[model samples]
Target: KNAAEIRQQFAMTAGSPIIVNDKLERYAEVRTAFTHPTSFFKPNYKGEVKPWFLSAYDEKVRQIENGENGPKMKAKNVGEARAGRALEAAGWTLDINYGNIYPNRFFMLWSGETMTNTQLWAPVGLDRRPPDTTDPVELTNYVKFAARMAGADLVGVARLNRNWVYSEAVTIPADVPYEQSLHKEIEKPIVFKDVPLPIETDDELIIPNTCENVIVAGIAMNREMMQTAPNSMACATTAFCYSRMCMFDMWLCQFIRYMGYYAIPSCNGVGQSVAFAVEAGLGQASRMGACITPEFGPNVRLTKVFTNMPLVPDKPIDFGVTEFCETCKKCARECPSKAITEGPRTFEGRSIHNQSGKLQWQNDYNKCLGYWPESGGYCGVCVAVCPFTKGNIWIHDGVEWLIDNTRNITEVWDGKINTYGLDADHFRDTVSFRKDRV
Candidate 1:
């Protein structure tokens, strides 16, 4: 299902603004932060955690001693990237306001595993067959319940649709060290096949025919923290939820694996998530291009586990976000880069970054990236300022009451929420993921 062909079957005329070019390949420049600012933070011998960070700390100390501002964490040969503070050298300081956000963003995410544990698991003499839990209804109950127990703020299920999957992925060439990966980035096609198992090739990303279900999990970040946008605490929640996303995939994947299934964890790389989240009935699509969940709105982060497990799919939700976004224009109005459009969703893209054929609120992502350094952080003015992100506007109207009473957090909080808790069996499952490993 190519986007262009799938698009013509429907009425894209209403939202078609930017022109679609069939040759509009994914822009190598705007692919990602790591690839974009390839030279912004060069790698040290130790890889991810070094050079940029540990080196920058020393640089920060030097800068502060000299009565200068933040450290000039510049790399040699940095290219044409958006910059807030231009220096004598053609490089910009990488935002470190989150205080050790990256490199430290490692994930030991999945718990409940010992290498020995996998070796001695009790089995019924190896049935060599599918488990009895092929029923989507029961699977839905178990998976959804397990998802909350595993660490999801909100959980929803949907069929795995390949359309949202990136046609080509941005990755460095094999055997290329981090120092040279920037220049080594190349597009690897993500393709589906009739194979029985999911696999990846050097030049292609492969999906199994059996991958029938997708479980999308929303990890909530703190409202108060996020409201402090473009700062330490704001970036703190952002960094934290990233690991939360990592842990989420691990926890959920292990659960599915234990239940006699196969699961692919995608905390970072796999496909476009917002589209999947929308299709999963998590929330309505917003003008900001993120899923606007009723519970946390755009403040929530998303991760997903794709699997062969039998599960029911959820329909796309419409909670008046589209209508509200149509007239509100708050996020667009407040966006630091003018990256969010006040106009209607369009099939055409405004730039090389956006994927054509989908009707969306198109805006210049390059401009958005430009603000990251200006704020000295990964700016979230769009997410922070979103009207839907404000809890009082939506959930408090008897909606929170329904979910809190009928549904439950079913887990412990890291003190990262407005309100929610789990119905743990003992006092055990209530332990936070940060403290007592599950």
Candidate 2:
């Protein structure tokens, strides 16, 4: 399928199928499950002055020595435990200050005064002048193609909505390192000002008024690993995708910069990922507080990039997730902490962790985060049980995805997916820097 067919598929509906809140509310940094007091302090279980994840970290190391996998679920013993912990830590690779706020606020910045790579090639005049092609239609194909090549399993475009962009970001002093960031955690206001580029002020993080588009991406996880949710193996897949989230941003951002545009790389920091994903046509919001995609259900992790590059936003799609969730209470039933809702969707939140005024399923996110400390890993039982997580999901209802989203080439274009990647003969051109890129 060509670009014409792909572009036309997005016009399937007269307008977006997903409902939008004309008066959606916004939240502060303190309201999130990660920061809320009710959920923040997990049991110390020992004489301690610090938090539990660090204490849990020590236990994870001990488990590897004692021949256990993370904490329990004696599924893999030592080998799996050590590998899982390592991957969990690696998830923060593209992040700054443990979270992804600072890295993107600065990591994504490219100027004539910065980025040696782009500056060195600027003499070629690509940076100084507008691109040969500035049309949003063709721009969609090129960047979506680049995004897949950059390691995204799924991608979508949408007009950036400030409601999803946090009023204040959870961040630390730029000079601080991860070692001290937890204690030094602070909140900075994200203010959109009338400016030419994204800048930082003494009091706020500023985004140029011109920067109004967001590109959301989905990084797929290993199915077998995720199946063992609430365990160390499941956490490992989550960790690995975070790093992939990091790698994807920089790769795509650079491609945009080289094309004479500014791209801001945000690997899980700048805004509400699920909101951007929903508007971008990736999928509908699920009762489990996830962006359920037709291609990967809620199993795939999300990341997004903000850019000034012109792009044709993909229209939102409806794949019966909201309807199915009404009957399929598997996630709510299987929830380790009973975090998901078994009842109907509502605009109200179950706790301070959720924003109000949106007509949607409001789950108890505090309960979800609380389970992390109790289980010694990020519990993802909700994702594991989703019926939409099929092996050939990219085949079932993905022709529109392929034609509408797939660009000119891919490692998986041949589509014979083995455990390692696309089949070797088919992906002869695919070069993986990741030795064990699961």
Candidate 3:
């Protein structure tokens, strides 16, 4: 059977996917590993102090010149390594920072009226007219179509869970420009308001009360590229997907506005994407703290759009990821920094970076981030070793499977680029003509 049939066959109840206690609180964006102050003093490849995440960028530079994929994984030559790094850099040109989450801020605009895209298509007045159809059934299909057209390899919808939304977002002062954004970072409260549209006040970023559902999208990564885990090529695919995520948020948001609804784009912001994606039936949470989908497994990238548009909420899915991750400690054993926990799921936080009260395996994300500086790349050994990333395969007889098993910067040099570096092997799955598109 096809994936669509298998997906429906595996659908869980129409409710929140993960288990949570009353103590579960809305997390603040500032507390994450990427934004936390503790990680800011970590040294880069050259012993230069900077944010730990920014230090990875410095490592990419060193890797390119050293002809190394990772600190240990060598490439064919320096030219190959440089090409991979160049592709990775080009992929992020459209994105501002890692997550385009700051509402009413660059690219992640809450409103589309002032956008160049909206103005260019003004003659059509798509945003001015009333919605053609408000039926949830029709709107669900319509918006999913737009999402696919916008480069979402997989798409789903779910009721907006305020618990997953950041109580306060990490952002820069509005007066500060993009160049100084990193240095001028600040925290702003993200409040749910009884307002007409998604708007930002001087004091807070606001989400409309009517914004009922979050549309989650999966931007698939290249298998060949990601297989070269902890390497320059793996970094390129991950970077390219981030740009694809940025595009998906903007494209789907504008489409929602054109259809007469307020839409908010959160490329890597506003809320926790793994929680949203799990609730949207896109995937199930794994031991590695990633949403493992049936198609791309943990190999895919995620982004989401919050909109007030009427749409049917997709049921959460469970394809045995919980049971599987319980036994499969592959990621934990393969982790260079030993970040992935070799323990049972619990309602606890491993460190300040983890939000407590969630029943899941808590991994040391700070340890994970620290490895990037030492490895000279955004090390992805966890993602690379996940058996689910095998694509259309099944895991049977664990030990026997373990025995069966298991990189260069070549694809970028060969110009094997597609819209967001999606694999051509399964591109047909995304094809839709007018009948399916509208």
- Each candidate's clash count: 1, 0, 0
| Stretches of model 2 off by over 4 angstroms after superposition | 1-23, 45-49, 97-99, 103-113, 119-122, 392-438
lDDT tens string, model 3, 1-438? 146655656888778968999889999898888778876557886788877767777877777777876786677888777777777778777788766766668988888989999999999999998888899888987898888889888888999999999999988788898889888888999998898888887899988889899999999988878888787778778888888888888889998999988899988888999999999998999999999987788999999999889988888887778888888899999999999999999998998899899999999998888888777667788998898887546433633211113304565456566655666766755554433322
What's the candidate order when arranged by decreasing lDDT?
3, 2, 1
lDDT of 2 by residue, 378-431 (tens): 878899887766443332254454311221011112223454222333222222
Instruction: Score residue 20 of candidate 1 by CA lDDT.
Output: 43
Error of 2 at 48 (Å): 4.7
Error of 3 at 296 (Å): 0.4
- Ranking 1 against 2 by TM-score, winner: 2
> What is the total number of backbone clashes in candidate 2?
0
Task: Give per-model TM-scores.
Answer: 0.68, 0.83, 0.92
Instruction: List lDDT for all candidates, in order.
Output: 0.57, 0.69, 0.82
Clashing pairs in 2: none
Lowest summed lDDT window (length 10), candidate 3: 398-407
Give me the runs in candidate 3 sitting further than 4 Å from their true place.
395-407, 410-419, 428-438
TM-score of 1: 0.68
